[PDB]
Amino acid sequence: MKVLFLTANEFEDVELIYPYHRLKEEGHAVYIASFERGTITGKHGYSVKVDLTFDKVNPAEFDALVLPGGRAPERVRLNAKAVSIARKMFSEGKPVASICHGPQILISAGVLRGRKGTSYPGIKDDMINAGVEWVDAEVVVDGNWVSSRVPADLYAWMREFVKLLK
Amino acid sequence: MKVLFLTANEFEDVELIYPYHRLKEEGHAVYIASFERGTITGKHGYSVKVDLTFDKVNPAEFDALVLPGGRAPERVRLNAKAVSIARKMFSEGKPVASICHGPQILISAGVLRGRKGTSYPGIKDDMINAGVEWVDAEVVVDGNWVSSRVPADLYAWMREFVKLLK
Amino acid sequence: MKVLFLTANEFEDVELIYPYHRLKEEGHAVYIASFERGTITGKHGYSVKVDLTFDKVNPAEFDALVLPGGRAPERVRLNAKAVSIARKMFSEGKPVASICHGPQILISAGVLRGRKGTSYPGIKDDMINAGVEWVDAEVVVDGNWVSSRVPADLYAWMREFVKLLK
Amino acid sequence: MKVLFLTANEFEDVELIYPYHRLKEEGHAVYIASFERGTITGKHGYSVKVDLTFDKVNPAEFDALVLPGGRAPERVRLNAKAVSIARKMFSEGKPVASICHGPQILISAGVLRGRKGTSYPGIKDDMINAGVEWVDAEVVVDGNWVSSRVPADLYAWMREFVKLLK
Amino acid sequence: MKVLFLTANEFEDVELIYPYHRLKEEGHAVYIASFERGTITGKHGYSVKVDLTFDKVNPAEFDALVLPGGRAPERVRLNAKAVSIARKMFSEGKPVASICHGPQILISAGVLRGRKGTSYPGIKDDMINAGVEWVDAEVVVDGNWVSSRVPADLYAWMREFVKLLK
Amino acid sequence: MKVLFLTANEFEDVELIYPYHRLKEEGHAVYIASFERGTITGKHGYSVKVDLTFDKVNPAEFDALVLPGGRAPERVRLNAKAVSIARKMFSEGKPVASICHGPQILISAGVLRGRKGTSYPGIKDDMINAGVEWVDAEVVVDGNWVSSRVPADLYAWMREFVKLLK
Ligand SMILES: [Tb+3]
Ligand SMILES: [Tb+3]
Ligand SMILES: [Tb+3]
Ligand SMILES: [Tb+3]
Ligand SMILES: [Tb+3]
Ligand SMILES: [Tb+3]
Ligand SMILES: [Tb+3]
Ligand SMILES: [Tb+3]
């Protein structure tokens, strides 16, 4: 499987690096998409190479989507192409993993009304206003959508997402 | 004229300091309310003293409210007492100034349905989902609510807010 | 009303941003002059665009001068052209606002003998040795010269400077 | 199964956080041991709670050992008790995972003579002088010892370590 | 000989550490005096232990004085006791070494009128207004006063100061 | 006399700057060699110009060698040319000063068997495994090799090294 990550500068470092390596362990191919080629730097200073830009992503070529948190989702959600990628993959029923501020991209895509999930508690009212049935749990699984809240939930977040990709 | 500020650590420094001094120029008494007494530190490292805690605020004692941005509103909006202060003052028709992420507190208060305003563009979809008629302008004035987007709007933000307090 | 600012990297962020927006509120045109075009960054990391270089400034084209503090004045005062701009505008009786280390430029211009004002207390002995009658006050107004000491004085500093430009 | 981590301040953040969550996914109990109770902070600023001090560790109570990298191993290897824990667990054939500078603790334990493994390439000559058959590979498995070199190897490092704990 | 250093937080790190070790090489005893006991931290993050406070210094007990630069001299020069120590030792003809912003303390002591020396070029006009015959040289020796400008002058600064202490 | 320094980014700032100026005081020519031309930055942010690259160094042209510490030696010791320079100069009996992690380069050169010296205590076991008779002292002098442990030893380190160059 080809797993796409939508992110940008000021991503929450462990929320990108943890699923990146956890999914590589399974033999899945992992791709970082962002605004431009080169590198992006997390809140804590970890640097990662960008594999492709949002403009070059064909959503049909990717099988699963991961949305790390941090401050990057508020930048990503203003890019119409990045939001279109998330709208298409999520609405087609492809596996989507979000954590922390990651689901702000799904709010902007207009795909969460009636869906059950979680997020960083600081944006729960925004998830509720987007029609989410918000749950305070380390991991929520709602069909193709696997959601978690904070870095302390990483173990449970990918435990459930890896099951979805099997 | 007693102006209350609702804020916390990681406030956007100039969005707190600019209205604080602009309103002191007019002879208004300015008060910083936060989670605990002592000091709070902005994103850029400026420190300010907390005058009172959210639990000690009686909203009837304050005439106007300022909501600076940064990452502080996502912490403030999880405090039921801080949200109740903003709900009471805004719903009473008292002057309320918000900028950048500041209106996340008003979203949580449930007072923005059908109101017209702006915010940091990164949360415009959350403002729209809360019932705001969102406008991309340096300053919007909707009755008692004066809203702006980013630090570049400071001059226009307080130019309009000062007129409401006269 | 064209207001010129003489500054450089490591300016005290709020001492530049506060008067910039306060004077824009009045409808005055504000200009940042520095060593080179592009951007300059304050002590706390705020970035601002440089409008023109010291070499391109014709002091006859500007009506008032603002001298923010920080570590920038110690760099600015070594530039003969920047010091000549401050000498000409101050000695012509045009309104000049200084705060914190800002008057180090006026010391270098040789215009403060027998004038009354203030500064960051750490350089009061240097102001006294330049012939200033130094006062420990949040704001001092001596004809065209409006001086303040530290960021806590911002409200009083521009309250008096705005009156001079009216 | 109880997994012990030996670490200190300036640990490489992802080298501690990644195996911590990867092993919690399997249902293993994970324990952070360091010099004192309270918290320790990684090179990149992530902070983690210390579960117990080196003096309180009884090696017989733990089933497996993880040695993250960063600058922490050079501090840990000067603590005779921490080195004795690593010596006892490694020499008893319990699973031991090391990455980056992590095996400096095993060098100090005197247990690597005639063993095959890897490390951060910057200390390969020190591993060779301790009697290691050094291999430049993302992961090496030598009986109970699973070793990796850098953060890019995380996926392979725990892929092999998890197999040892099954 | 007992060499006293007058300094505080935000000292220029190499300007304190270099003379400290260079004078210890000669067998001189070296003492750091500051506002309070404990430690002080330089601009670049080096930490040094404070040996005694300004209040506990008896200038008669010290044979030579060193004044490092950085931002510390602007804090030190506001302390009447620290300025009195520098006034007494300098006016008694004891060896005094200054570099960079270090001579701001001697300006405040009122001992430089007619003396020949140098400093950080950014404060040369303040040295001139204090009556200094200012020279642009890596090191100036004027009787008991050895002065230098910047970190690049360290080699020449202590080359001359060590000769004075022989 | 020409003194060569082998170093890189993340050198311990005072361990490079202190011997650089101490040896310039004696009139010796000092040269910084690193991976590329331009500048290198220490752990604490001091920046120094690189005089020449490792590939351009002819060991016959230099009379003495300095090896500062920090994290730079673990990068330098992976460059076969930099290790060959240290090997050639040390094995020819030219004066060699090392401090802290600096002797990791000599370990990699294979020249320390049966030699007496010291280092940062965190790598003493690696020095012992390289055949060093390790001593816990502020300075050790073994023929041409002058070694010290930490920044607190600077005064003693160059006191002994300067005697070798006379
Ligand atoms: Tb940011
Ligand atoms: Tb934060
Ligand atoms: Tb600076
Ligand atoms: Tb460190
Ligand atoms: Tb052997
Ligand atoms: Tb400072
Ligand atoms: Tb590093
Ligand atoms: Tb042997």
Numbering used by the authors:
A (entry chain B), B (entry chain C), C (entry chain C), D (entry chain A), E (entry chain B), F (entry chain A): 1 to 166
From the paper:
We performed two SAD phasings by merging several data sets obtained through the MeshAndCollect approach using protease 1 and pb9. P. horikoshii protease 1 (PhP1) crystallization was performed in sodium malonate pH 5.5. Crystals with dimensions ranging from 10 × 10 × 10 µm to 30 × 30 × 30 µm were used. Data were collected on four different mesh loops corresponding to four different crystallization drops, leading to 81 sub-data sets. Among them 27 were selected and merged by HCA using ccCluster with a distance definition based on the correlation between intensities and with a coefficient linkage threshold value of 0.3 [Fig. 1(a)], resulting in statistics indicated in Table 1. Despite the soaking in the concentrated solution of Tb-Xo4, half of the crystals, coming from four different supports, were sufficiently isomorphous to allow the merging of their respective data sets. For both presented examples, even with soaking of the crystals in a solution containing 100 mM Tb-Xo4, the level of isomorphism between the crystals was sufficiently preserved and kept sufficiently high to derive useful phases.
